[PDB]
Design a protein around this ligand. Structure first.
Ligand code: CLA
Ligand code: CLA
Ligand code: CLA
Ligand code: CLA
Ligand code: CLA
Ligand code: CLA
Ligand SMILES: CC(C)=CCC/C(C)=C/CC/C(C)=C\CC/C(C)=C/CC/C(C)=C/CC/C(C)=C/CC/C(C)=C/CC/C(C)=C/CC/C(C)=C/CC1=CC(=O)C(C)=C(C)C1=O
Ligand SMILES: CCCCCCCCCCCCCCCCCC(=O)OC[C@H](CO[C@@H]1O[C@H](CO)[C@H](O)[C@H](O)[C@H]1O)OC(=O)CCCCCCCCCCCCCCCCC
Ligand SMILES: CCCCCCCCCCCCCCCC(=O)OC[C@H](CO[C@@H]1O[C@H](CS(=O)(=O)O)[C@@H](O)[C@H](O)[C@H]1O)OC(=O)CCCCCCCCCCCCCCC
Ligand SMILES: CC1=C(/C=C/C(C)=C/C=C/C(C)=C/C=C/C=C(C)/C=C/C=C(C)/C=C/C2=C(C)CCCC2(C)C)C(C)(C)CCC1
Ligand SMILES: CCCCCCCCCCCCO[C@@H]1O[C@H](CO)[C@@H](O[C@H]2O[C@H](CO)[C@@H](O)[C@H](O)[C@H]2O)[C@H](O)[C@H]1O
Ligand SMILES: [Ca+2]
Lengths: 57, 31, 135, 506, 38, 63, 39, 30, 31, 30
């Protein structure tokens, strides 16, 4: 089956391992270039193209 | 030959649309 | 049949062939070359009907299957012109005991025009010939 | 159930049905080859091998038959222009027929292998499960590939038992299929040397036979077996996709740049021949040789073959087409009928002028005429308020030598400007545009279309390599990571990344 | 035998001797010196 | 598993699944052959690229 | 020879959201490429 | 008549938008 | 307008064939 | 090019004949 069926809509648990993701990306570049905070990471995701499109507008 | 310009699309659709209807109904059988 | 699939009909003929030699002949021998002209009548006669029943002295003079566009085709007007061909009969074998003669021919003549629908092609025919001369 | 993009994965552990789908795929490729050849033969015009060859007509599979020895139809005609030739069964029609019969037979064998999937050959006798010894399968297939490569080099291409291959003169005027002797020197690595292609197939076939024997006899090292996951058929899929895109990039390159295997009589000229004036320089060499012998300009220009002047035309360059300008090049400028001859443009002071030729980059190009020392003496102005070098102002006349307009001189600036625009495109040709209702924009040849398809497929097949390589190497985590994975991924806990035995405990 | 052939052969020799071989030697050396205790 | 005559002929050619040489085996000789193959591909690429010019021929349609 | 049933068969699924995504993808690809097909 | 084809593909896209909104698979917590 | 003569059939088939594939697979789901 | 359409419909009929014979629903007594 598709991996997307491993997520249930409304489930309380997290569907991925943020520590594994951070342990991958902080070895891809280096440790402190990687977000260990999901809120900080999601803010950065929101902020970067919004600020760029504000500037070009 | 100076055939009808719509003859090819009419022939392909006249075959294809009921072919699609039959294939749709056959493949879903047993649901 | 030509390479490419073109089928060439033609009216192979020796009709009214008149053919002269060089002057100064006292006999018929291996040096006798009758070179001359013959008539080539049209491949289809004037009584021929095309697949839409058009011809020269019979048939329609128009495209009757297309009543508003009947007279816009040049193929409605059929014609059978008289063509001309060239024939060389070169004698190579003379049997003087019975007057028999044999040899080769080269001929050039137009092909079928299909009642003047198309231009005729040039056809060259080579072969052999025999005759009996009455002494 | 399965997602739509994973349906073919049902054959993954089913060697009988895997053979079946392989047979079905082959049946479809062979049937495409037969049907494409039959369609091309149904529409091919064989009347003029000079100004309407196969690469002007959009013929895609006819040059590949022509390349290896099939040059002739049943219906009389040869692509070499010869007529009266007996091909036997192996005409274009016979080859197309054979591919259609092969396709039918492979379809039937696909059906058998689908129904009768459960053959004992496919089961390990140790276990009960289905198993394929992929290294031994590789040895067998490589041995046979080596045998077929060696035979195609030594018998077909050499003519020992076979027709040989298409060779030609450097200017594509005398192309014909002939036996080719192998070239065993460094000139065997010249890509325009056909003897290099023969040597390749003999030597690589011999090396394939030897490498097949090794791979039939010697088991893989355990390090390589575990490293490359040799018990998984997806590793073969990944490496085979890799070799296949390597080969596709190579064939795209040798089609685009030119090769002994991509002759210009079969696929059209290259863009680089137009870029460097390859054909122009030869035509001029030939005219200059005839002028040095003592001929007049009309006499010298009349000895240039129409085929050679046809190669020196920008509408035969494959870098002039469009992605959605479809079909034959005859649907573009038209069917070429005759060479109009060579123009010489002269100003009122009798300076010979040449029109600057249109490069491959330019959809449109300004009409510029320069003298012998590169000074612009005439042009066609855009703004005619401050024009100084208009054809009308400089009194440019044009005289044609050879071709349809031989001995003619034009002095009307309308005709002179029209012939200047024709000279922009190279040698001028009269075109029949009403047969195919030609729209007036250039198409690319089969050379450009082949390069495009094979360059794009090669690039897409890189993704397929990376995908299937990844799925091979990461099969244990394809449905997700282990439910722990907390202490293994943390920074500084272990001396080695991921190695559980190298814990610092510090 | 051409100057470009000689330059290609020297390219092979110097690509081994400048890039490949001392990287290989230094990697083997630093791996055998700075080992991991399990 | 259904037996067939051909399957019985072909059976010893699919009977050594998973059989390995322990250790590194012939991997050094394989690496030598890959290095020679890389040198060969470099040679023919540089000939085609006209970065490697040899006597006796020219990379051109005439040759 | 016997015609034994194959155990490697699996059902295929396409849920309604995937159908809407596919139909939208097909429609916008037609929108994009139709002008070029007509040329 | 190419306008008919353009109107058809644009209408198909808009109809898919209507059916994807009004008759979506409803999200349910289970 | 002098459009490609195959443009209409290419556009309709380019839309219709994958539309048919998706409809076939959707309607049979749940079997 | 009308010949292509004729060949296609005749081929479709013959292929339906093949699949209707070789892969028919097998008659079973139950
Ligand atoms: C690879 C090269 C490159 C790249 C990456 C970009 C990238 C960009 N360019 Mg630049 N540009 C380039 C080359 C490039 N350009 C070149 C070569 C030129 C010269 C020819 C220009 C000339 C140029 C101009 C003149 C402009 C840009 C602009 C932009 C921006 C467009 C995106 C944008 O504004 O989003 C922002 C998002 C929107 C505009 C979308 C608004 C959507 C509304 C709110 C809703 C619409 C809903 C819709 C109707 C229906 C929805 C469907 C359904 C709900 C019914 C973006 C930053 C534009 C820009 O800076 O914008 C301010 C701009 O005006 N570029
Ligand atoms: C008896 C078998 C047979 C024969 C004699 C032919 C003969 C022909 N075919 Mg057909 N074909 C066959 C079977 C056959 N085919 C099958 C089974 C299929 C289905 C897959 C096809 C599909 C097919 C297509 C799609 C086309 C042809 C075409 C052709 C013609 C050109 C062939 C060509 O350029 O080859 C080119 C072949 C190669 C360049 C082979 C490259 C192989 C690579 C280089 C090797 C891969 C690496 C190797 C395995 C590893 C190294 C080994 C080494 C160390 C030894 C020619 C008349 C063409 C044609 O004109 O159609 C009318 C064409 O377009 N054929
Ligand atoms: C006397 C022996 C002999 C002779 C005379 C030849 C002669 C030839 N060999 Mg063969 N060869 C032989 C023995 C021989 N071989 C043996 C024993 C083997 C071992 C099995 C090979 C293996 C072999 C291979 C694998 C190839 C040749 C090729 C060639 C041709 C080289 C000219 C050419 O077109 O290169 C053109 C090809 C190249 C210069 C190779 C390109 C390498 C690319 C650049 C690397 C790819 C990187 C990446 C994937 C591409 C991305 C690019 C990016 C911009 C997108 C020529 C016919 C080549 C060929 O068939 O070309 C048609 C070829 O690829 N040979
Ligand atoms: C490598 C494959 C290949 C190549 C190089 C050629 C090359 C050629 N063929 Mg052949 N052909 C092929 C395969 C190929 N063909 C196959 C498989 C078939 C069977 C369908 C045919 C059927 C065929 C016919 C019937 C005819 C040709 C003709 C021609 C010529 C004109 C090509 C043309 O107009 O294309 C135009 C190409 C395009 C406009 C590009 C279309 C590509 C689409 C737009 C891409 C779609 C993108 C995709 C939807 C995006 C994905 C979305 C994303 C979410 C991932 C040329 C010599 C013609 C000719 O002159 O015959 C003598 C002709 O009449 N061919
Ligand atoms: C020999 C080449 C080859 C082979 C045998 C396979 C085989 C496979 N692939 Mg791979 N793949 C390849 C090349 C190859 N692929 C390439 C080149 C790419 C990059 C484009 C990919 C990208 C890829 C992805 C992303 C995935 C696979 C998956 C799969 C598996 C299931 C595919 C399936 O069910 O499709 C069913 C497909 C359809 C029902 C519709 C496909 C419609 C396509 C888009 C257009 C039709 C193409 C046309 C008919 C034929 C022309 C193609 C030809 C010219 C090459 C199967 C093992 C899947 C997998 O791993 O599952 C576990 C998967 O997720 N492949
Ligand atoms: C972005 C490029 C890229 C990436 C990420 C991968 C990744 C992968 N490959 Mg692929 N591969 C590639 C390109 C790539 N490959 C190319 C271009 C080819 C040749 C066609 C291959 C052929 C190939 C095979 C045959 C196999 C893999 C395998 C693998 C997997 C294991 C790692 C491996 O073997 O790497 C390959 C290593 C590299 C690509 C790096 C090589 C570095 C080269 C040798 C440096 C040489 C420099 C050269 C002298 C420069 C001069 C050039 C200049 C003159 C033009 C992995 C998924 C294996 C696999 O799928 O396992 C499941 C496998 O069996 N690869
Ligand atoms: C022996 C031989 C020859 C071998 C050589 C090796 C050797 C032994 C040498 C030793 C010396 C040595 C190693 C170096 C010398 C060589 C040298 C100088 C190398 C050059 C280095 C180089 C070219 C670097 C430039 C390339 C590069 C990697 C650039 C920086 C990239 C970068 C800073 C990007 C990160 C920026 C950023 C904002 C990150 C967040 C991005 C983002 C939003 C990700 C989303 C995301 C992040 C998460 O975090 C998690 C969790 C989740 C969920 C998630 O979504
Ligand atoms: C079952 C399904 C099969 C049917 C599918 C329906 C498909 C519909 C759309 C098809 C797309 C092609 C339309 C082109 C427009 C057209 O009418 O062409 C029409 C052309 C024919 O073109 C005609 O040719 C004639 C001469 O025979 C005349 O010259 C006509 O003037 C000319 O229009 O058809 C083709 O050429 C098809 C061959 C395609 C080969 C392309 C090779 C390049 C490969 C590219 C791969 C790209 C991949 C991108 C990946 C991402
Ligand atoms: C720019 C950066 C450059 C990066 C380079 C850094 C190093 C790269 C690593 C190379 C890895 C290659 C394969 C792995 C090694 C291996 O096979 O096992 C290691 C083996 C066996 O290990 C031995 O094996 C023995 C038994 S058995 O063989 O394993 O069974 C065992 O007893 C013993 O303990 C064990 O050590 O050791 C050797 O015998 C070394 C032989 C040399 C390695 C072969 C590589 C081939 C390349 C040749 C290139 C030059 C050719 C010239 C062409 C013009
Ligand atoms: C059964 C049988 C038979 C028959 C056979 C036949 C008749 C056949 C055939 C076949 C054929 C006749 C085929 C075919 C094919 C085709 C194909 C396979 C194709 C295709 C396609 C494609 C794939 C394409 C795609 C595309 C498009 C669409 C567009 C553009 C893009 C591209 C190119 C991608 C016989 C009697 C012999 C024998 C017995 C059995
Ligand atoms: C497995 C066999 C099953 C049958 C499939 C065979 C038919 C498929 C099409 C391929 C036919 C190609 O074969 C070719 O067709 C054309 C078109 O009629 C023929 O051409 C014929 O008609 C055209 C016009 O109608 C004439 O201009 C031409 O002079 C004439 O010979 C060729 O003489 C023939 O060699
Ligand atoms: Ca003025």
């Amino acid at each position: 089956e598709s991996q997307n069926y491993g997520y249930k809509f409304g489930q309380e648990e997290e569907t991925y391992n943020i520590v594994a993701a951070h342990g991958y990306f902080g070895r891809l570049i280096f440790q402190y270039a990687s977000f260990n905070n999901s809120r900080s990471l999601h803010f950065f995701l929101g902020a970067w193209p919004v600020i760029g499109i504000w500037f070009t507008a | 030959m100076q055939v009808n310009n719509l003859g090819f699309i009419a022939s392909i659709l006249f075959v294809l649309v009921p072919t699609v209807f039959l294939l749709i109904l056959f493949i879903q059988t047993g649901k | 049949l030509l390479p490419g699939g073109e089928e060439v009909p033609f009216f192979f003929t020796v009709k009214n062939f008149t053919g002269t030699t060089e002057p100064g002949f006292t006999s018929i021998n291996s040096s006798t070359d009758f070179v001359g002209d013959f008539n080539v009548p049209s491949y289809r006669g004037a009584g021929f009907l095309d697949p839409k029943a058009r011809g020269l002295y019979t048939g329609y003079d128009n495209a009757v299957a297309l009543p508003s566009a009947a007279d816009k085709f040049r193929t409605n007007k059929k014609e059978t012109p008289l063509g001309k061909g060239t024939l060389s009969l070169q004698v190579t074998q003379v049997d003087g005991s019975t007057g028999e003669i044999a040899g080769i021919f080269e001929s050039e003549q137009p092909s079928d025009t299909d009642l003047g629908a198309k231009e005729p092609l040039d056809v060259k025919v080579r072969g052999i010939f025999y005759g009996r001369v009455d002494t | 159930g399965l997602p739509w993009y994973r349906v073919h994965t049902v054959v993954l552990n089913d060697p009988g049905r895997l053979i079946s789908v392989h047979l079905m795929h082959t049946a479809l490729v062979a049937g495409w080859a037969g049907s494409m050849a039959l369609y091309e033969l149904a529409i091919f015009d064989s009347s003029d091998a000079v100004l309407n060859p196969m690469w002007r007509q959009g013929m895609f599979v006819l040059p590949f038959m022509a390349r290896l020895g099939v040059t002739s139809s049943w219906n009389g005609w040869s692509v070499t222009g010869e007529t009266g030739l007996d091909p036997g069964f192996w005409s274009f029609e016979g080859v197309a027929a054979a591919h259609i019969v092969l396709s039918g037979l492979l379809f039937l064998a696909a059906v058998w292998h689908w129904v009768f999937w459960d053959l004992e050959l496919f089961v390990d006798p140790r276990t009960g499960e289905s198993a394929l010894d992929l290294p031994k399968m590789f040895g067998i297939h490589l041995f046979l590939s080596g045998l077929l490569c060696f035979g195609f080099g030594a018998f077909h291409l050499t003519g020992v038992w076979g027709p040989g291959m298409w060779v030609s003169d450097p200017y594509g005027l005398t192309g014909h299929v002939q036996p080719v002797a192998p070239e065993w020197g460094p000139a065997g690595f010249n890509p325009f040397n056909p003897g290099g292609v023969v040597a390749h197939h003999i030597a690589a076939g011999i090396v394939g036979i030897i490498a097949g024997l090794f791979h039939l006899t010697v088991r893989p090292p355990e390090r390589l077996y575990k490293a490359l996951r040799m018990g998984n058929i997806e590793t073969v899929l990944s490496s085979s996709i890799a070799a296949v895109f390597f080969a596709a990039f190579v064939v795209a390159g040798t089609m685009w740049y030119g090769n002994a295997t991509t002759p210009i009589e079969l696929f059209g000229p290259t863009r680089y021949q137009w870029d460097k004036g390859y054909f122009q320089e030869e035509i001029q060499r030939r005219v200059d040789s005839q002028l040095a012998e003592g001929a007049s300009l009309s006499e010298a220009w009349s000895t240039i073959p129409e085929k050679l002047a046809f190669y020196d035309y920008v509408g035969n360059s494959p870098a002039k087409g469009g992605l959605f300008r479809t079909g034959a090049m005859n649907s573009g400028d038209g069917i070429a009928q005759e060479w109009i001859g060579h123009p010489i443009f002269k100003d009122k002071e009798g300076r010979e002028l040449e029109v600057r030729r249109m490069p491959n980059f330019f959809e449109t190009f300004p009409v510029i005429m320069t003298d012998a020392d590169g000074v612009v003496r005439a042009d066609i102005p855009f703004r005619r308020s401050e024009s100084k070098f208009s054809v009308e102002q400089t009194g440019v006349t044009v005289s044609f030598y050879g071709g349809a307009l031989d001995g003619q001189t034009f002095s009307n600036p309308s005709d002179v400007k029209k012939f200047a625009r024709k000279a922009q495109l190279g040698e001028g040709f009269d075109f029949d545009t009403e047969t195919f209702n030609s729209d007036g924009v250039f198409r690319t040849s089969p050379r450009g279309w082949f390069t495009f398809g094979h360059a794009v497929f090669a690039l897409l097949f890189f993704f397929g390599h990376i995908w299937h390589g990844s799925r091979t190497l990461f099969r244990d985590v394809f449905a997700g990571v282990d439910p722990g994975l907390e202490e293994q991924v943390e920074f500084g806990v272990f001396a080695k990344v991921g190695d559980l035995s190298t814990r610092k405990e510090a | 035998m051409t100057p470009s052939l000689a330059n290609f052969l020297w390219s092979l020799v110097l690509g081994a001797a400048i890039v490949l071989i001392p990287a290989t030697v230094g990697l083997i050396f630093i791996s055998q010196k700075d080992k991991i205790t399990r | 598993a259904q037996r067939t005559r051909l399957g019985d002929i072909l059976r010893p050619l699919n009977s050594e699944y998973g059989k390995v040489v322990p250790g590194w085996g012939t991997t050094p000789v394989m690496g030598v052959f890959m290095a020679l193959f890389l040198v060969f591909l470099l040679i023919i690429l540089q000939i085609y690229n006209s970065s490697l010019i040899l006597e006796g021929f020219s990379v051109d349609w005439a040759g | 020879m016997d015609r034994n049933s194959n155990p490697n068969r699996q059902p295929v699924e396409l849920n309604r959201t995937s159908l809407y995504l596919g139909l939208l993808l097909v429609a916008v690809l037609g929108i994009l490429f139709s002008s070029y097909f007509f040329n | 008549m190419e306008s008919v084809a353009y109107i058809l593909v644009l209408t198909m896209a808009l109809a898919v938008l209507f059916f994807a909104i009004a008759f979506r698979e409803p999200p349910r917590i289970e």
